Structures are given as C-alpha cells and as structure tokens.
Amino acid sequence: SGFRKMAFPSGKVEGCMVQVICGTTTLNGLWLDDVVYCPRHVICTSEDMLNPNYEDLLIRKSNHNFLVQAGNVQLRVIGHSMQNCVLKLKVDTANPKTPKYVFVRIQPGQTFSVLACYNGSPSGVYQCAMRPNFTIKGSFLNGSCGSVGFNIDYDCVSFCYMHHMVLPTGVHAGTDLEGNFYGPFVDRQTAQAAGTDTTITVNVLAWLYAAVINGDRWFLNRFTTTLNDFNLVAMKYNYEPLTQDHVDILGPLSAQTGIAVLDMCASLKELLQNGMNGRTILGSALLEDEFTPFDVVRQCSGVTFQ
Amino acid sequence: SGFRKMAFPSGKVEGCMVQVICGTTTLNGLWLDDVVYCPRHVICTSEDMLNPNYEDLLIRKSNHNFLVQAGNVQLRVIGHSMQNCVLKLKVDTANPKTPKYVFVRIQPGQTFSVLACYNGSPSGVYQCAMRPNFTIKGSFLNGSCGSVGFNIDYDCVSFCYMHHMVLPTGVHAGTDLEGNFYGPFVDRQTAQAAGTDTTITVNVLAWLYAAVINGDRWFLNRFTTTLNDFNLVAMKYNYEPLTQDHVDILGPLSAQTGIAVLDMCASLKELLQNGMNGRTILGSALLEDEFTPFDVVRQCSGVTFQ
Numbered sequence: 001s002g003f004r005k006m007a008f009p010s011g012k013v014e015g016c017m018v019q020v021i022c023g024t025t026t027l028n029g030l031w032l033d034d035v036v037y038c039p040r041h042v043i044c045t046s047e048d049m050l051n052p053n054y055e056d057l058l059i060r061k062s063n064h065n066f067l068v069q070a071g072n073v074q075l076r077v078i079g080h081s082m083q084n085c086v087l088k089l090k091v092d093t094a095n096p097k098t099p100k101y102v103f104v105r106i107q108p109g110q111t112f113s114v115l116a117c118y119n120g121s122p123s124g125v126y127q128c129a130m131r132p133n134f135t136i137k138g139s140f141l142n143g144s145c146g147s148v149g150f151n152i153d154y155d156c157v158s159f160c161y162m163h164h165m166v167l168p169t170g171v172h173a174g175t176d177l178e179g180n181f182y183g184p185f186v187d188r189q190t191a192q193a194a195g196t197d198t199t200i201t202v203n204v205l206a207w208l209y210a211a212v213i214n215g216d217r218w219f220l221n222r223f224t225t226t227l228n229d230f231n232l233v234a235m236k237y238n239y240e241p242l243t244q245d246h247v248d249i250l251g252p253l254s255a256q257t258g259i260a261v262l263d264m265c266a267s268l269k270e271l272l273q274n275g276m277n278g279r280t281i282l283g284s285a286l287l288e289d290e291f292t293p294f295d296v297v298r299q300c301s302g303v304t305f306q
Numbered sequence: 307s308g309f310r311k312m313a314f315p316s317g318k319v320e321g322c323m324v325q326v327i328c329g330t331t332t333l334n335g336l337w338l339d340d341v342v343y344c345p346r347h348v349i350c351t352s353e354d355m356l357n358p359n360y361e362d363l364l365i366r367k368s369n370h371n372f373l374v375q376a377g378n379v380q381l382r383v384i385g386h387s388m389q390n391c392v393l394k395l396k397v398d399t400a401n402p403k404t405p406k407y408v409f410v411r412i413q414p415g416q417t418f419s420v421l422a423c424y425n426g427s428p429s430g431v432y433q434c435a436m437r438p439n440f441t442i443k444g445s446f447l448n449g450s451c452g453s454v455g456f457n458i459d460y461d462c463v464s465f466c467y468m469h470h471m472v473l474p475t476g477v478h479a480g481t482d483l484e485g486n487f488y489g490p491f492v493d494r495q496t497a498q499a500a501g502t503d504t505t506i507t508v509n510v511l512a513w514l515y516a517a518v519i520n521g522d523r524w525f526l527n528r529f530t531t532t533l534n535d536f537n538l539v540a541m542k543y544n545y546e547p548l549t550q551d552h553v554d555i556l557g558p559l560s561a562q563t564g565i566a567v568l569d570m571c572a573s574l575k576e577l578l579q580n581g582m583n584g585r586t587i588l589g590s591a592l593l594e595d596e597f598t599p600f601d602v603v604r605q606c607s608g609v610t611f612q
C-alpha cells in the first residue's frame with residue numbers, strides 16, 4: 001500500500017565516508033579498504049578551479065599535504081595517484097567497515113540513492129535517476145563534492161556516482177568511481193550546459209503499473225497498440241523510444257497486474273495526447289519517470305538487504 | 307542547488323532493527339539497550355486480529371514463545387510486558403549499537419524518516435509527515451509492522467513512530483514508541499476511516515521559500531496581506547490557519563530570502579485563488595506541504611549528523 005520515492009538504507013555507505021582536507025579546501029571521500037576516493041579538485045584553490053592543470057597541481061603535493069579525518073581518528077596518507085577526475089589516497093589503515101562493494105557505470109534512466117555529505121558527515125539520503133542528457137536532478141550545497149551514489153544488492157554496495165559540480169538550470173554532474181564523467185562535462189569552473197533532456201518512457205510505464213497496483217486505475221482504456229504506433233506518438237512529446245528490451249524489462253509488472261505492456265502503452269498514448277483532465281495519478285499531476293521497473297517491483301514486493 | 311524529499315541517514319536505526327517471531331507471526335522490532343519494542347499484534351493469529359483480546363493472548367505466552375533474531379544471533383527473551391499497543395521484550399544481551407536516543411510524540415505537520423523493514427532487515431528509507439488527521443502517507447507491505455519513524459538531532463535518534471496498519475484510501479496509522487496510537491485508531495482488523503485531511507499551510511510557505519532560494523520566483527507578487535485576510539482565504543480551500551507561532555517558525559526563511567512572511571502569504575493567496583496557470587514550482591504542478599520550515603533550512607543550509 002502506498003508508493004514513495006524510496007532510497008536504499010544508507011548505513012553501509014555511512015561507515016565509508018571521511019573528510020578529506022588539502023590545505024584550505026575540504027570535501028568528502030569514500031574510504032574502502034586502505035584507499036580513500038575523492039574528487040581531484042580538492043587540491044585546487046578557488047583561483048585554480050577556473051582553469052586547473054590537475055597534473056601540475058598534484059606534482060607539488062606530497063602525502064603530507066592531505067589530511068583524512070574518519071570520525072575522531074586522523075588517517076596517515078602514504079600514497080596518492082590520479083585516475084581521471086578522482087583522486088585516490090592510500091592510507092595506513094584499512095576501513096574495518098568496508099562492505100562488499102563494486103564500482104559500476106550506470107546507464108541513463110537507471111536510478112540510485114545519493115548520500116549527501118558535508119565535512120565527511122552524512123546529512124541526508126534521496127533517490128535520483130541518471131537523465132538521458134547524463135545529468136542528475138540532485139540536491140547539493142557547497143562542500144558536498146565527494147558524496148556518492150549507490151545501489152544495494154543484498155549485501156553488496158554498487159557505487160556508481162561521485163558528485164563534482166552543478167550546472168546551469170540547477171542540474172548536477174559527476175563521475176563514476178573511476179573518475180570518468182557522465183556526459184561531456186569537465187571539472188572546470190567554466191560555462192557548460194547539458195543537452196536537452198528526455199522523458200524515460202519505460203520508467204513512466206513502470207510508474208503507471210505502480211498506480212494500478214495501488215488501485216489508481218482511471219487511465220486504463222480498452223485499447224491496445226503496436227510498438228511502432230506508440231513510439232511515433234511518444235517522439236512528438238520528447239519521450240524516448242520504447243525498445244523490445246524495455247518491454248522485456250516490464251514483464252514482471254505485466255505479470256503481476258495482468259495488463260499487457262502494449263495495453264498499458266495504449267493508456268500512456270491517450271494520456272500524452274489528451275492530458276490528464278485535471279486528475280492525478282499516485283497523487284501527482286505530472287507523469288513520473290524516475291522509478292525503474294525494478295524499483296516498482298522492489299517497492300511493490302518488498303526486497304530487503306543485509 | 308536543487309530540492310528533494312530528503313530522509314535522514316538511516317545507519318543508526320539500521321543497527322537497532324531485529325526480527326521478532328511469535329509462533330507463526332513475524333514482524334520487526336526495535337532493539338535498544340536490552341529491550342526489544344514491537345507491535346503487540348505479533349502474538350495474534352490471523353483469526354485473532356479480527357477482534358483480539360491482547361491481554362488474554364499475552365497471558366498464555368511465556369518468554370520462550372518469542373524468538374528474536376538479530377543478524378545470525380538469536381537473543382534469549384527473559385521478560386515481557388505490554389505498554390499500550392507496543393510489546394516490550396527484555397533480552398539477555400544489550401544492543402552494543404544502541405545510539406543515543408529519545409522517545410518523542412510528534413505533532414501533526416511535522417516530518418520524519420521511515421525505515422521500512424521486513425523480517426528484521428532494512429529495505430528502504432523515505433520521508434513522511436504526520437497529517438492533520440493523524441495518518442501518514444507511507445509505503446508499506448505485509449510484514450512491515452515494527453518499522454519505525456525517526457528524526458536525527460546530531461547524534462541523537464528521536465523515535466516518534468512505529469507502524470501498525472493501513473487504512474482505507476491507502477493511508478497508514480501507527481503509534482509512538484510508548485504504544486499510544488496517533489489518532490483515534492485501534493489495532494484491530496475492523497472497518498475504520500480517517501477524518502478529512504487538511505493542507506499544512508506553514509509547510510507550503512516553507513516550500514515556497516525553498517522555491518525562491520532555488521531561483522523559482524514567478525509566483526512572487528508586489529502585494530502584502532494581513533494574517534486575518536490570508537487565513538480567511540485559506541479556510542475556503544481546506545488550508546489550516548496560520549498562527550503567530552507558524553510565522554515565528556518561518557522567520558529563518560524570511561531572513562535568508564529577504565521576503566517577509568506576509569508577503570509570501572500574499573503570493574500563496576493569489577496561487578490559491580487563481581491557480582498555477584499551467585506552471586510548475588520546483589518541478590511540481592501541485593503545492594507541496596510535507597516540508598517543514600526546519601527541513602527547508604536543513605536542506606538549504608546543510609546540517610550534518612554523526
């Protein structure tokens with residue numbers, strides 16, 4: 001009963017967050033085994049960030065130029081290297097709370113939880129999606145860089161995002177844990193802008209299935225459609241094409257509700273053409289595209305994690 | 307930059323969740339010091355829940371009728387007592403991960419995070435508000451009872467909610483940690499219904515301040531109003547009266563944005579009378595009332611917790 005934007009429990013990630021200080025700049029780091037991962041612009045001054053040469057700036061720093069704070073314990077940095085846009089600091093102590101973990105790169109349309117942190121301390125948790133233009137609609141303030149995005153699979157934390165910057169229009173950009181940016185952005189304070197966004201069509205349909213599961217079923221019609229006919233209508237409204245892979249992804253929701261994917265596509269097509277006529281779906285006046293089909297299954301079937 | 311429904315980090319609460327089994331019924335429990343708190347209907351069968359006599363059912367059970375599972379460790383129950391609608395189980399081992407904590411009863415309009423759990427394992431976290439009709443719009447499945455709501459103050463976990471039931475229209479009802487229900491509901495499977503809900507007016511204004519902070523300021527007009535004039539309009543739209551205490555609560559947001567509370571009240575009054583004219587605020591087509599003024603300050607100023 002009910003449906004909300006639900007984040008993964010964050011305790012496993014909380015035990016990995018540390019504060020990284022380089023001179024006067026401070027931000028968050030991820031402590032896994034004996035390595036701390038953090039954005040490379042921790043080594044920049046405010047002036048440096050306008051046009052930085054990270055390799056040149058890292059040259060002039062030794063291990064003693066970095067201070068890592070984990071709770072009330074300072075960790076000695078005994079090595080450092082740069083991998084793309086993330087800095088890796090080897091420390092003399094391995095994190096005893098290191099969970100089983102993996103570094104992944106997610107695709108546009110997939111969701112993850114964000115643990116927003118400041119000065120190495122967790123502050124809040126929320127759910128986000130990687131937009132088709134490779135931004136995320138996050139909530140970050142100054143000092144939030146180093147905050148990570150993740151998904152939990154039973155006992156394994158899949159880290160997929162580290163926060164680096166906010167763009168015009170207030171959207172956010174970052175890297176995977178190997179330091180490669182999502183999208184064409186660079187970690188320099190210069191004018192950059194994301195491309196036009198798109199509505200994640202498969203996520204809307206998953207959200208529509210969630211509405212039916214919770215008894216909100218006014219938008220269901222008696223029609224069907226073909227994948228070609230639906231996609232032609234969707235493109236005119238800046239909706240992404242629905243592929244056969246997306247249909248297969250939606251299979252579990254079709255089986256639970258007894259509504260064929262193409263029948264639900266007929267309902268969405270009507271909603272796109274005629275609007276919602278002043279009605280709401282799951283309490284929302286706009287169609288929602290930041291729930292993946294697995295999010296709907298997990299929330300409407302109750303998968304737990306240890 | 308940006309604004310989301312943000313939950314508190316849940317790690318402190320995750321270390322307190324256990325599985326409570328009584329015969330065939332299973333649900334979640336809260337393990338603090340050497341006591342486990344859980345809903346009292348764990349001692350019911352499916353038939354019992356239709357019209358239970360909890361005192362009579364508890365009579366016929368000893369400490370050995372309860373099995374508490376904390377991870378891979380079973381805890382021996384060495385005592386049990388009933389306090390209102392919560393059952394308290396004394397165990398032979400105190401929780402070493404017991405955080406500093408307090409039991410509070412919240413007021414309608416205040417928010418809290420929910421750690422949804424099943425079989426004692428955390429599954430997801432989301433933010434909720436206590437509605438004026440003393441329900442919450444949660445997301446719960448079968449076996450979710452014992453899940454708790456909480457707020458974090460630095461290092462202290464303030465527990466304010468334990469989940470017990472879902473009502474018609476899909477809203478949820480529960481108790482404080484002393485077992486007293488929020489609202490007139492009872493833990494019996496019989497037809498019950500919540501009163502008419504109301505829009506938390508002070509929370510809407512706080513959310514409007516969050517919009518201005520994030521540059522979304524089309525709804526600001528050049529007018530002011532009196533508290534009496536605004537409240538008269540608000541009542542016709544099922545909005546709660548705005549008191550002087552609510553105005554004082556809003557003070558920090560007025561100081562940060564430089565917009566007087568009554569000037570923002572003039573904007574809300576116009577929105578209520580004329581609608582939104584097809585526009586959105588913070589990406590929403592409806593006014594949002596589940597952010598308290600402190601939530602806005604915390605998210606737009608970045609308070610952390612250890």
Ligand SMILES: *C(=N)[C@H](C[C@@H]1CCNC1=O)NC(=O)[C@@H]1[C@@H]2[C@H](CN1C(=O)[C@@H](NC(=O)C(F)(F)F)C(C)(C)C)C2(C)C
Nearest residue numbers: 041140141142143144145164165166167187188189190
């Ligand atoms: C990390 N601690 C911050 C988080 C920012 C700060 C406010 N909201 C956020 O998400 N990251 C930065 O300050 C990054 C970083 C330099 C500058 N920066 C920016 O986000 C800037 N944005 C851009 O330059 C633009 F236009 F490309 F988006 C800023 C103007 C300061 C908001 C580096 C190294 C890119």
Ligand SMILES: *C(=N)[C@H](C[C@@H]1CCNC1=O)NC(=O)[C@@H]1[C@@H]2[C@H](CN1C(=O)[C@@H](NC(=O)C(F)(F)F)C(C)(C)C)C2(C)C
Nearest residue numbers: 347446447448449450451470471472473493494495496
């Ligand atoms: C705790 N594990 C469950 C959580 C429920 C189950 C589905 N969604 C939820 O939130 N709590 C219950 O099953 C409680 C509990 C008996 C029955 N119950 C209900 O929520 C029932 N609701 C009502 O009887 C009514 F109308 F008052 F809301 C049910 C019809 C089973 C949904 C007790 C002891 C009240």
